[PDB]
Design a protein around this ligand. Structure first.
Ligand SMILES: [Zn+2]
Ligand SMILES: [Zn+2]
Length: 389
């Protein structure tokens, strides 16, 4: 609604297509003005009244968004002015990676918002200056907390705006060219969403890190958490059921024992050399704690028996071990000479198969350690052969 209220102020295909071009322009004008409104009526006045570290946390990247969107609006207006806006698609494609600053924004939205509200709850002089700023900017129609939710909503709408314009473009050449911009804007929307998703994962990893004792390494090295919980376990050597707490991540299983407030790490299992084998024995009597599957070292060096309280739990853990092993060893990991392994990309990277961006901030995809080709899990079989021209 906030974005809809902000953007509030029988037909032929050409007439419908021209209405889409008008909406794209007018919404960008109103959007670029809103960034100017947040800067001139909230940022610059509060610079003289809050700490520069406070300024970086609440206003984040906004100053940079306004600069990117001022230039974007100009190059779009120039593209719209030319005959039949034939080169509009080029403006969207050019600004795609320039818009990746929305990654840095959307990640810290709750972080910047939460910070602002306590600041307002604590300082009495801040609370009414913000109420005065809302009046001078829009006559009390939109508050700052609501105004900071507008940039996330905007970057997520470009692909929807371009979807409609594509739907009404008659000329097949211009339609194909607009489809490329639609793909560039759908890719950007996915990156932004994957960034939000990854910070929650990293926040969850940080929490596990604190709760686990005698763990000498960062959990983040073992990928994404899959499932955690209590279970009973036996090994080739210890055939008596031991009550344990486990954390399953893509590359590891941490077998802990509750040592009061904390979980004490007892057994670290690298899933790179382990296989899961189902056991139907528990199905028959369906007695609590009888539901098992085996977790065996691929050369038979070790073999665990994992007991869950219910059949649903067993089924759920099994499915998560399969998903974890599939992530270590995806389909076609060794296709056409490669050796694709889970990789965390530090810089902006595109897939060697589809040319679309690797999404997120953490274990976004795969890297072949031999040729250094980067790729998404789905695109592995389609990457050109290892070490070629
Ligand atoms: Zn790909
Ligand atoms: Zn390779």
């Amino acid at each position: 609604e906030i974005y809809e209220d902000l953007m509030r102020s029988k037909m032929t295909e050409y007439d419908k297509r021209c209405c889409c071009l008008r909406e794209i322009q007018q919404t960008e004008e109103k959007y670029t003005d809103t960034l100017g409104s947040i800067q001139q009526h909230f940022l610059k006045p509060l610079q003289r009244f809050l700490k520069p570290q406070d300024i970086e946390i609440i206003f984040i990247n906004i100053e940079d968004l306004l600069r990117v969107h001022t230039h974007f609006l100009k190059e779009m207006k120039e593209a719209l002015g030319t005959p039949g806006a034939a080169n509009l698609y080029q403006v969207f494609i050019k600004y795609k990676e320039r818009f990746l600053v929305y990654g840095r924004y959307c990640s810290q939205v709750e972080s910047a918002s939460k910070h602002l509200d306590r600041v307002a709850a604590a300082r009495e002089d801040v609370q009414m200056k913000l109420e005065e700023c809302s009046q001078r900017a829009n006559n009390g129609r939109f508050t700052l907390r609501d105004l900071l939710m507008v940039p996330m909503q905007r970057v997520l709408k470009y692909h929807l705006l371009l979807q409609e314009l594509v739907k009404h473009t008659q000329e097949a050449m211009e339609k194909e060219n607009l489809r490329l911009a639609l793909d560039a804007m759908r890719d950007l929307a996915q990156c932004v969403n994957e960034v939000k998703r990854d910070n929650e994962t990293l926040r969850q990893i940080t929490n596990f890190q604190l709760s686990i004792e005698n763990l000498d390494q960062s959990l983040a090295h073992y990928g994404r958490p899959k499932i955690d919980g209590e279970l009973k376990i036996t090994s080739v050597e210890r055939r008596s059921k031991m009550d344990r707490y486990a954390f399953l991540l893509d590359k590891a299983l941490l077998i802990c024992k509750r040592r009061g407030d904390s979980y004490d790490l007892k057994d670290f299992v690298n899933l790179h050399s382990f296989q899961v084998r189902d056991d139907s024995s528990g199905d028959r009597d369906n007695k609590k704690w009888s539901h098992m599957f085996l977790l065996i070292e691929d050369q038979g060096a070790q073999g665990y028996e994992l007991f869950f309280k219910t059949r649903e739990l067993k089924k759920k853990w099994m499915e998560q071990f399969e998903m974890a092993i599939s992530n270590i060893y995806p389909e076609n990991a060794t296709a056409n000479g490669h050796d694709f392994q889970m990789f965390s990309f530090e810089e902006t990277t595109s897939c060697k198969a589809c040319q679309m961006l690797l999404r997120g901030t953490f274990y976004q995809g795969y890297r072949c350690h031999r040729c250094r080709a980067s790729a998404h899990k789905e695109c592995l079989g389609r990457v050109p052969p290892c070490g070629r021209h």
